[PDB]
Structure 1
Amino acid sequence: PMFIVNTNVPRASVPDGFLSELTQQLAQATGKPPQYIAVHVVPDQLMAFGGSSEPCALCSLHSIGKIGGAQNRSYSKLLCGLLAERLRISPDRVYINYYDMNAANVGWNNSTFALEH
């Protein structure tokens, strides 16, 4: 899985330990091994939410499976909680786009995750 956060919160406000916390908490939430979790944090961005430049975040989570109604609401609670606690971003100024990726459409290690045919 891969999780990206783009935010106008300054780099200096991203706490030590943040990428590792995301890595471990997403491993737990998705049931996938930590070794396969990638995280990407992009501070200092020029962005607005609702026309306001108060702290906000635009995020993406890509996973092969483990994407769906109840699961995505769970991820949102988890990830909004982290963004609120660590970056002081209000949950109602966060968007997270969820993508259920087909194994054939994710490349890795010179191939993809579709090895069957």
Structure 2
Amino acid sequence: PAAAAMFIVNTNVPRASVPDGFLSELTQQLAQATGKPPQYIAVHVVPDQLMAFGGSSEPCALCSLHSIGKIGGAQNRSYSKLLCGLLAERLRISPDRVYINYYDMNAANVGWNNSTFA
């Protein structure tokens, strides 16, 4: 599929708790997992959010992975283990307090560089 993918993390954990290296690690790990070049992976981390999961304000995250292709039942299970693992290790968020929404984007529906990936 065309090369783009993007991963967003929204979390209540504080800015101070995001490791140096985290966005770079997300980029490299997602490139590897999706088979996409890192040049076309975008990552976005949003700490300090007002959020709750199950009515509790213990650490949690709501995430999205938008990808042109490379989305499906088995792949998404694999991404979830990878990404929950990174959020647990790096941000100290329990995997049972993380949702990740997966979106398979059509290339014609991803704009870039004044045009689209179609």
Please list every run of 5 or more consecutive structure 1 residues that lacks an aligned counterpart in the other structure.
none
Which ranges in structure 2 are unaligned for 5 or more consecutive residues? Answer: 1-5
1:1-117 maps to which residues of 2 (within 5 A)? 2-114=6-118
Identity of aligned residues (%): 100
Question: Deviation digits for residues 52-80 of structure 1, max 9, x if unmatched?
Answer: 00000000000000000000000000000
For 1:80 and 1:51, the matched residues in 2 are separated by 20
- Give 3-state SS (helix, strand or coil) of 1:32's partner: coil
**Whole-Å Cα distance in 1 between the matches of residues 43 and 37 of structure 2?**
14
* Secondary structure of the structure 2 residue equivalent to 1:74: helix
Query: How many residue pairs were aligned?
Result: 113
Distance 2:8 2:79 in 1: 13
Give the ranges of 4+ consecutive aligned residues of structure 1 lying more than 6 Å apart after TM superposition. none
SS at match of 2:27: helix
TM-score normalised by structure 1 residue count? 0.96
The offset of 1:50, in angstroms, is: 0.2
Shift of 1:36: 0.2
RMSD: 0.2
Deviation at 1:8, TM superposition (A): 0.1
- TM-score w.r.t. structure 2 length? 0.95
Q: Secondary structure at the match of 1:15?
A: coil
